Amino acid sequence: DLMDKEGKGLIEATLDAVRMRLRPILMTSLAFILGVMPLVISTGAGSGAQNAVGTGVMGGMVTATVLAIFFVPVFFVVVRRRFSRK
Amino acid sequence: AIGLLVDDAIVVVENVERVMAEEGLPPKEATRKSMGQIQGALVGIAMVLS
Amino acid sequence: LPTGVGYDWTGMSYQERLSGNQAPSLYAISLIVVFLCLAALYESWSIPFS
Amino acid sequence: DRPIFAWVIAIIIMLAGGLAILKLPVAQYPTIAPPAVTISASYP
Amino acid sequence: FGWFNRMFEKSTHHYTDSVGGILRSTGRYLVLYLIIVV
């Protein structure tokens, strides 16, 4: 929405985009993990199925944000896929 | 679902909150052109979640 | 074993199990619909691969 | 009007359409006649 | 509070300048993505 509508930014539009939304990526991710916290442990008798659900998403969200918003793709991708050839 | 529920609500509210600071503007029209950026996703994500 | 002795799998199990056979096909169409929906609101051949 | 969006509607028909041929009867003509029940006893 | 002063420091410094660092490179972090798939 910045590349087309506004200005290109070969690498300075993807970087300028997270400059104005590191907030909601860590607002959802942090609030989600805390809402799944009661299932991961806490309840340990009433229903053991709670532990089966919350373990598979709490572990997956730490790695789907402290990884996505950084280091490995979700930034790197848009570079080599759109740019670099066509 | 609770997770994929307050997430969709989060993007609508806080993207206005930046629009009310980036270019300090409280009014109704601040909320309208916030959906210029968001609406494109809103329906897009709805399809790929399905 | 000797003649006049065959077999038939009795008898709750199954009709195409879950971790196996099923799962592969379910995730396969999940990639074909994710790719198409990321394109209806984007128009490219690069954005959806991200 | 636009390329992508229209072609993606047609690609839904490529799957779901060719999925109906893999998941629906392939037989002769359908049910035609009024369906009848038939009793049959035997006194030898 | 100092909670807002921290959020603006990490996001703007720190994170966004280290996003400039990762974007300069490419071949190392792609081979790291492939090591994640292994």
Swiss-Prot record, chain B:
Disruption phenotype: Loss of susceptibility to contact-dependent growth inhibition (CDI); inhibiting cells still contact the target.
Compartments in which it is found: Cell inner membrane
Spans within the Cytoplasmic topological domain: 14-38
Inducing or repressing factors: Positively regulated by MarA, Rob and SoxS transcriptional regulators (at protein level).
Domain of life: Bacteria
Transmembrane segments: 39-50
Family: Belongs to the resistance-nodulation-cell division (RND) (TC 2.A.6) family.
Function noted in UniProt: AcrA-AcrB-AcrZ-TolC is a drug efflux protein complex with broad substrate specificity that uses the proton motive force to export substrates. (Microbial infection) Involved in contact-dependent growth inhibition (CDI), acts downstream of BamA, the receptor for CDI. Its role in CDI is independent of the AcrA-AcrB-TolC efflux pump complex.
SUBUNIT field: Homotrimer, with large domains that extend into the periplasm, interacts with AcrA and TolC. AcrA may be required to stably link this protein and TolC. Interacts with AcrZ. Part of the AcrA-AcrB-AcrZ-TolC efflux pump.
Name this polypeptide is given: Multidrug efflux pump subunit AcrB
Species the sequence originates in: Escherichia coli (strain K12)
